[PDB]
Design an enzyme around this catalytic site. Sequence first.
Site, PDB file in Angstrom:
ATOM      1  N   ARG A 162       0.815  -1.214   0.000  1.00 16.78           N
ATOM      2  CA  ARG A 162       0.000   0.000   0.000  1.00 16.78           C
ATOM      3  C   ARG A 162       0.853   1.271   0.000  1.00 16.78           C
ATOM      4  O   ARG A 162       1.779   1.370  -0.798  1.00 16.78           O
ATOM      5  CB  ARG A 162      -1.036  -0.079   1.137  1.00 16.78           C
ATOM      6  CG  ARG A 162      -2.078  -1.175   0.878  1.00 16.78           C
ATOM      7  CD  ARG A 162      -2.872  -1.584   2.115  1.00 16.78           C
ATOM      8  NE  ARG A 162      -3.613  -0.468   2.724  1.00 16.78           N
ATOM      9  CZ  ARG A 162      -4.791   0.004   2.306  1.00 16.78           C
ATOM     10  NH1 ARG A 162      -5.394  -0.525   1.247  1.00 16.78           N
ATOM     11  NH2 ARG A 162      -5.374   1.023   2.961  1.00 16.78           N
ATOM     12  N   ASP A 216      -3.173  12.688   9.052  1.00 16.05           N
ATOM     13  CA  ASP A 216      -4.528  12.406   8.576  1.00 16.05           C
ATOM     14  C   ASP A 216      -5.189  13.758   8.301  1.00 16.05           C
ATOM     15  O   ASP A 216      -5.313  14.582   9.197  1.00 16.05           O
ATOM     16  CB  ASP A 216      -5.316  11.604   9.630  1.00 16.05           C
ATOM     17  CG  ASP A 216      -6.679  11.116   9.116  1.00 16.05           C
ATOM     18  OD1 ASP A 216      -7.312  11.805   8.286  1.00 16.05           O
ATOM     19  OD2 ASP A 216      -7.114  10.009   9.537  1.00 16.05           O
ATOM     20  N   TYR A 227      -7.797   6.041  17.545  1.00 19.72           N
ATOM     21  CA  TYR A 227      -7.082   6.321  16.315  1.00 19.72           C
ATOM     22  C   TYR A 227      -6.903   7.841  16.166  1.00 19.72           C
ATOM     23  O   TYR A 227      -5.815   8.308  15.835  1.00 19.72           O
ATOM     24  CB  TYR A 227      -7.848   5.767  15.118  1.00 19.72           C
ATOM     25  CG  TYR A 227      -7.283   6.233  13.805  1.00 19.72           C
ATOM     26  CD1 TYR A 227      -6.127   5.649  13.274  1.00 19.72           C
ATOM     27  CD2 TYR A 227      -7.886   7.283  13.107  1.00 19.72           C
ATOM     28  CE1 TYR A 227      -5.601   6.093  12.066  1.00 19.72           C
ATOM     29  CE2 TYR A 227      -7.372   7.738  11.901  1.00 19.72           C
ATOM     30  CZ  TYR A 227      -6.229   7.150  11.393  1.00 19.72           C
ATOM     31  OH  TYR A 227      -5.736   7.596  10.188  1.00 19.72           O
TER      32      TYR A 227
HETATM   33  N1  LIG Z   1      -5.191   4.910   3.288  1.00 18.01           N
HETATM   34  C1  LIG Z   1      -5.832   6.053   3.574  1.00 18.01           C
HETATM   35  O1  LIG Z   1      -6.858   6.396   2.999  1.00 18.01           O
HETATM   36  C2  LIG Z   1      -5.284   6.953   4.648  1.00 18.01           C
HETATM   37  C3  LIG Z   1      -6.042   8.033   5.113  1.00 18.01           C
HETATM   38  C4  LIG Z   1      -5.514   8.847   6.123  1.00 18.01           C
HETATM   39  C5  LIG Z   1      -4.258   8.557   6.642  1.00 18.01           C
HETATM   40  N2  LIG Z   1      -3.548   7.508   6.176  1.00 18.01           N
HETATM   41  C6  LIG Z   1      -2.242   7.233   6.763  1.00 18.01           C
HETATM   42  O2  LIG Z   1      -1.264   6.927   5.758  1.00 18.01           O
HETATM   43  C7  LIG Z   1      -0.405   5.877   6.223  1.00 18.01           C
HETATM   44  C8  LIG Z   1      -0.496   4.693   5.258  1.00 18.01           C
HETATM   45  O3  LIG Z   1      -1.862   4.323   5.013  1.00 18.01           O
HETATM   46  P1  LIG Z   1      -2.157   2.789   4.582  1.00 18.01           P
HETATM   47  O4  LIG Z   1      -3.645   2.651   4.318  1.00 18.01           O
HETATM   48  O5  LIG Z   1      -1.127   2.376   3.565  1.00 18.01           O
HETATM   49  O6  LIG Z   1      -1.814   2.009   5.970  1.00 18.01           O
HETATM   50  P2  LIG Z   1      -2.271   0.499   6.355  1.00 18.01           P
HETATM   51  O7  LIG Z   1      -2.147  -0.332   5.102  1.00 18.01           O
HETATM   52  O8  LIG Z   1      -3.576   0.553   7.093  1.00 18.01           O
HETATM   53  O9  LIG Z   1      -1.090   0.121   7.389  1.00 18.01           O
HETATM   54  C9  LIG Z   1       0.262   0.191   6.941  1.00 18.01           C
HETATM   55  C10 LIG Z   1       1.097  -0.808   7.724  1.00 18.01           C
HETATM   56  O10 LIG Z   1       1.073  -0.531   9.129  1.00 18.01           O
HETATM   57  C11 LIG Z   1       1.687  -1.675   9.712  1.00 18.01           C
HETATM   58  N3  LIG Z   1       1.224  -1.955  11.081  1.00 18.01           N
HETATM   59  C12 LIG Z   1      -0.040  -2.058  11.535  1.00 18.01           C
HETATM   60  N4  LIG Z   1      -0.024  -2.391  12.855  1.00 18.01           N
HETATM   61  C13 LIG Z   1       1.265  -2.522  13.237  1.00 18.01           C
HETATM   62  C14 LIG Z   1       1.997  -2.878  14.483  1.00 18.01           C
HETATM   63  N5  LIG Z   1       1.318  -3.152  15.630  1.00 18.01           N
HETATM   64  N6  LIG Z   1       3.357  -2.913  14.416  1.00 18.01           N
HETATM   65  C15 LIG Z   1       4.039  -2.618  13.280  1.00 18.01           C
HETATM   66  N7  LIG Z   1       3.447  -2.309  12.104  1.00 18.01           N
HETATM   67  C16 LIG Z   1       2.087  -2.239  12.051  1.00 18.01           C
HETATM   68  C17 LIG Z   1       1.271  -2.896   8.864  1.00 18.01           C
HETATM   69  O11 LIG Z   1       2.407  -3.730   8.538  1.00 18.01           O
HETATM   70  P3  LIG Z   1       2.301  -5.327   8.221  1.00 18.01           P
HETATM   71  O12 LIG Z   1       1.382  -5.412   7.032  1.00 18.01           O
HETATM   72  O13 LIG Z   1       3.760  -5.647   7.950  1.00 18.01           O
HETATM   73  O14 LIG Z   1       1.776  -6.008   9.465  1.00 18.01           O
HETATM   74  C18 LIG Z   1       0.616  -2.260   7.648  1.00 18.01           C
HETATM   75  O15 LIG Z   1       1.014  -2.882   6.422  1.00 18.01           O
HETATM   76  C19 LIG Z   1      -0.875   5.484   7.613  1.00 18.01           C
HETATM   77  O16 LIG Z   1      -0.080   6.168   8.589  1.00 18.01           O
HETATM   78  C20 LIG Z   1      -2.315   5.973   7.640  1.00 18.01           C
HETATM   79  O17 LIG Z   1      -2.800   6.208   8.976  1.00 18.01           O
HETATM   80  C21 LIG Z   1      -4.034   6.706   5.199  1.00 18.01           C
HETATM   81  N1  LIG Z   2     -12.067   8.068   5.497  1.00 19.71           N
HETATM   82  C1  LIG Z   2     -11.216   7.042   5.516  1.00 19.71           C
HETATM   83  N2  LIG Z   2     -11.443   5.842   4.960  1.00 19.71           N
HETATM   84  N3  LIG Z   2     -10.377   4.944   5.126  1.00 19.71           N
HETATM   85  C2  LIG Z   2      -9.336   5.468   5.800  1.00 19.71           C
HETATM   86  C3  LIG Z   2      -8.204   4.811   6.117  1.00 19.71           C
HETATM   87  C4  LIG Z   2      -7.785   3.684   5.400  1.00 19.71           C
HETATM   88  C5  LIG Z   2      -6.609   3.040   5.798  1.00 19.71           C
HETATM   89  C6  LIG Z   2      -5.912   3.502   6.849  1.00 19.71           C
HETATM   90  N4  LIG Z   2      -4.788   3.104   7.444  1.00 19.71           N
HETATM   91  N5  LIG Z   2      -4.539   3.850   8.398  1.00 19.71           N
HETATM   92  N6  LIG Z   2      -5.408   4.744   8.498  1.00 19.71           N
HETATM   93  C7  LIG Z   2      -6.312   4.571   7.538  1.00 19.71           C
HETATM   94  C8  LIG Z   2      -7.432   5.230   7.209  1.00 19.71           C
HETATM   95  S1  LIG Z   2      -9.712   7.071   6.235  1.00 19.71           S
END
Ligand SMILES: NC(=O)c1ccc[n+]([C@@H]2O[C@H](COP(=O)([O-])OP(=O)(O)OC[C@H]3O[C@@H](n4cnc5c(N)ncnc54)[C@H](OP(=O)(O)O)[C@@H]3O)[C@@H](O)[C@H]2O)c1
Ligand SMILES: Nc1nnc(-c2ccc3nn[nH]c3c2)s1
Lengths: 249, 240, 250, 250
Positions: C13, C143, C156
């Site tokens: 991701r 975020d 969160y």
């Molecule tokens: N995706 C969105 O729409 C969105 C929106 C707002 C903010 N963000 C922020 O952007 C960043 C990336 O988003 P994302 O959706 O790519 O994240 P994600 O896929 O939800 O999580 C990324 C990685 O975090 C690691 N993780 C989770 N729990 C853990 C633990 N206890 N110890 C160590 N590693 C851990 C996991 O690694 P493993 O797979 O190796 O276990 C996972 O692959 C995050 O900080 C997220 O909060 C994303």
């Molecule tokens: N409005 C949002 N919908 N999904 C979100 C999202 C998805 C994956 C994430 N991993 N860390 N935080 C996350 C927020 S925030």
Amino acid sequence: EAPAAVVTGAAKRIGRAIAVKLHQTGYRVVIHYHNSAEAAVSLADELNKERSNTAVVCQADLTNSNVLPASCEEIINSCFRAFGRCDVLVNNASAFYPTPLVGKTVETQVAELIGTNAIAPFLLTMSFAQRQSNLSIVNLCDAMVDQPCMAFSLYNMGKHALVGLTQSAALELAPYGIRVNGVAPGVSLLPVAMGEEEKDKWRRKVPLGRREASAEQIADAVIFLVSGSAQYITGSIIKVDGGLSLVHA
Amino acid sequence: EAPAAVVTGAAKRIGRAIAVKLHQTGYRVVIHYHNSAEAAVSLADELNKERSNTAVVCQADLTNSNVLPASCEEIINSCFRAFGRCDVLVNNASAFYPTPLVQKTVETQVAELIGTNAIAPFLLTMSFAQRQSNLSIVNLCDAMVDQPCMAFSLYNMGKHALVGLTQSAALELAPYGIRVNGVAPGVSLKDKWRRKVPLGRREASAEQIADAVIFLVSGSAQYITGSIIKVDGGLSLVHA
Amino acid sequence: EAPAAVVTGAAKRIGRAIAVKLHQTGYRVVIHYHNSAEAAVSLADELNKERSNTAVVCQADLTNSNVLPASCEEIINSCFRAFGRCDVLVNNASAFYPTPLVQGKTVETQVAELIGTNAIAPFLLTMSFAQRQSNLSIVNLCDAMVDQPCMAFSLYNMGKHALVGLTQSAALELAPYGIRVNGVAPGVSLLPVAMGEEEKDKWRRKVPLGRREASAEQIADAVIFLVSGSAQYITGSIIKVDGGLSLVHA
Amino acid sequence: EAPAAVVTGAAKRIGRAIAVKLHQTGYRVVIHYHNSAEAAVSLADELNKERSNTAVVCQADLTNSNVLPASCEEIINSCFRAFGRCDVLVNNASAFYPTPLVQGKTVETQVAELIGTNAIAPFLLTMSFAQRQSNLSIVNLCDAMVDQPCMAFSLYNMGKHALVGLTQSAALELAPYGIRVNGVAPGVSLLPVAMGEEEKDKWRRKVPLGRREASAEQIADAVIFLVSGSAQYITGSIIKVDGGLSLVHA
Ligand SMILES: NC(=O)c1ccc[n+]([C@@H]2O[C@H](COP(=O)([O-])OP(=O)(O)OC[C@H]3O[C@@H](n4cnc5c(N)ncnc54)[C@H](OP(=O)(O)O)[C@@H]3O)[C@@H](O)[C@H]2O)c1
Ligand SMILES: Nc1nnc(-c2ccc3nn[nH]c3c2)s1
Ligand SMILES: NC(=O)c1ccc[n+]([C@@H]2O[C@H](COP(=O)([O-])OP(=O)(O)OC[C@H]3O[C@@H](n4cnc5c(N)ncnc54)[C@H](OP(=O)(O)O)[C@@H]3O)[C@@H](O)[C@H]2O)c1
Ligand SMILES: NC(=O)c1ccc[n+]([C@@H]2O[C@H](COP(=O)([O-])OP(=O)(O)OC[C@H]3O[C@@H](n4cnc5c(N)ncnc54)[C@H](OP(=O)(O)O)[C@@H]3O)[C@@H](O)[C@H]2O)c1
Ligand SMILES: Nc1nnc(-c2ccc3nn[nH]c3c2)s1
Ligand SMILES: Nc1nnc(-c2ccc3nn[nH]c3c2)s1
């Protein structure tokens, strides 16, 4: 002996509720109005019936122009003429209508939306400060300033400018003992022109009670800020929005 | 009959002033303490002399541990036991000290500056909400949260988390009629600082903080939720 | 001669997109992962085929505990052991799930995961990155919706607020050491894998700019900017990459 | 076909650096100026020496008046007349001077200048830009110190707050047309030329990152990022380029 307050746009709605509540608190009031002469005079009558010689009206257009500074000076002057002092200024008057980016000219829309919402508050603040106890100014801001209504750019710009004024005047007027703060409604008394279906749409977004703020609830916050219980508060803006600004799209 | 309020860290300074002012407004009060038993009892004695059986004390360590949830549950329970109701939660207890990034174990510092300042407020909020008219929670925030003190990263992190809690809980508890707001002091949290305060002619006091709490819990704030009122004499507006 | 970066949660991701783009920019990379071992090794393999000895993996649980400081120290140490330097830290790993205030993990497990991964580990990693020390910087994944949070996500949201605090506090304190600290704040980017398309589309339609979520690459683009020489005067800034989402009222 | 950009107040300092960097990136540029004709023309000549027919100048007073809307329409029109298109608008022109609340130009002149240049002209140019309309975007020069304003700069500060509101409102409204709207917020950048070095140093010393002001080029770098394909999901965002200055308490 009784302190005095100016409330702009005080003939109706939120300004009226603010004027009423200030008066109930012991203030003598200048009820500023632009078009609402009948309602303004009727309010001053009601207030004077309660304690004689405690309310006057003052008419002024708050649209920006080369004579806006004289009009704002006149509003502050009217408080000193009637009451010999001016302790509180409430910048409540506001124009509100869309100005899409894509029958008034654009320079008229600028004069109204930026003049009433920001420039008039600035000139009134200047006049208030220059003419000078618990002195303070309260600006009516907008809780939704960072999540604005679509096509309301000039309105939103004026309200952003009013935040800047609140902060800048708080800083600059603090050495003179004048506090400057804001009250920021979310949805309160909805526009008269708005249909009931659109009104209900907005009401349903509000976390706290799924209803708009009463005018009195807005005035309650103004009362706090002008009170002795807020004497260390300056440059603060209190949202009175039932949580509306916290709700994502 | 009379509403009841829990105040954490209520034995001294700001929490004391808050407990006193709520009591003066007609609340029955739970005075929480960790180490300040003598001070807590002294305050309770003073309040009960004014009105009989209107003030109790409650001991709990608010450090994050496997037992923090139980302790927070007990604080809220102690209000219901004494008074049959719990209308107001003031999250006032705070740890404050620097944690430099370039150098108590760090995980102990975490337990205090995050546990006490943010996790305990979260658990107390859960317990308060679970156990449920003018209900509200007031969190003691920090006016300088976006211009933080040098080397106070964990402290600043906890106070930022507390803003997040204030907003998240305001949203989630609105349906229950529970309002959640904050009061953010400045220098009340030495002469060098006072000269920087725009309203510096007035001394900062714990009572000025309590005044804002009293407003937020009052019927005059019944449409206010998710708001944080700065009570800092304009300090946060002053550039470097 | 090539600089080196640690990316946490980089197996998939957004973290993968960031590691890939840093690698394409010329960085050697530590791919941190927790459970995603296959995906992590597989990514390191791909990058190492492109340029040999340029990617390593490092396994760590970032849940808070009394050993979290050691685990964070080890992640940074892994970068110095593999590459002799550590120029960039990207705090990307995150736990994300609801924690309702009114009611099968224990609450203390939820606290340890949501606050540990999102805030405490970034703090400890920042400490270790700084103490082990050119264009040095840290980028925290924040975020954009931190002030308009998802209902029932208090822990969160607390964690992500704390991360804004760390970003600002660390920018202030590390500036004298020439370390910049900034944030990138997605709105909706890659939706959760567990989310159905209909729910995905509800979020998509909220976004003013194109009614679609950010690609992982779009998030990574902003990270790349902040670590670049084009951002040498930028510290303590958080760049929203949200298509306007945070500006939309209820 | 090379894209085209309008930069207001482009004759000198920050606007000049922005015009230069856009030109280096392959943009044709309209160099707007008010009083600085010689500097504007010298810049256009330098740019046209690099690539013929890629720079024009456009004179306009951006003070608010009943002719301001026509002037702003003419600025946008000049880009279309010269280059057949207008891809980027940079609202850079600014008046800056104190306006004490408590006791020259009349106050309404100060309003026309501080609010006109800083907020109303950007609004009118945004209207004209949009009405005339692939990677379209607008960048507004904001102020990182907007919530910690200089003493006695109320009108300046009001105009810069208004500009934040314009950035957000226009981002929302123009997103359906694919026009992104963002800001760059300097803290201390190029100080006045006449300002004594001892006074410049008072400000320099406050900046955590390097105890120095931003160069004009550092500000321009953030502008270039925002208009680039690397920012195509970014709208309504304001990037501080301030060396951590806004994070420093009194
Ligand atoms: N995706 C969105 O729409 C969105 C929106 C707002 C903010 N963000 C922020 O952007 C960043 C990336 O988003 P994302 O959706 O790519 O994240 P994600 O896929 O939800 O999580 C990324 C990685 O975090 C690691 N993780 C989770 N729990 C853990 C633990 N206890 N110890 C160590 N590693 C851990 C996991 O690694 P493993 O797979 O190796 O276990 C996972 O692959 C995050 O900080 C997220 O909060 C994303
Ligand atoms: N409005 C949002 N919908 N999904 C979100 C999202 C998805 C994956 C994430 N991993 N860390 N935080 C996350 C927020 S925030
Ligand atoms: N109601 C809400 O939901 C809401 C939400 C956010 C913010 N607010 C703010 O709270 C304040 C009060 O709200 P409201 O709904 O009571 O306001 P309102 O009824 O829309 O307007 C208040 C008064 O402003 C005066 N006004 C308008 N144009 C003027 C001009 N050119 N010169 C002088 N006065 C002028 C009018 O006076 P005359 O009638 O005498 O002509 C009017 O009675 C406003 O500042 C508003 O922006 C309200
Ligand atoms: N420099 C900093 O430290 C700093 C800090 C915060 C924000 N900013 C913002 O960054 C942007 C650029 O900064 P800067 O210091 O380079 O600006 P500046 O040199 O003070 O002003 C830029 C240009 O604005 C034009 N201008 C002024 N009044 C005008 C009017 N009435 N009509 C038309 N044009 C007018 C002038 O053009 P002519 O010379 O052609 O007359 C001037 O050269 C500005 O928006 C500024 O507010 C700068
Ligand atoms: N969401 C909103 N709906 N109406 C609003 C409103 C109503 C009356 C006003 N007067 N000034 N400003 C106003 C905003 S705000
Ligand atoms: N702290 C600051 N010192 N000078 C600043 C400055 C200098 C030139 C400017 N032109 N527009 N705005 C300006 C701010 S800001």
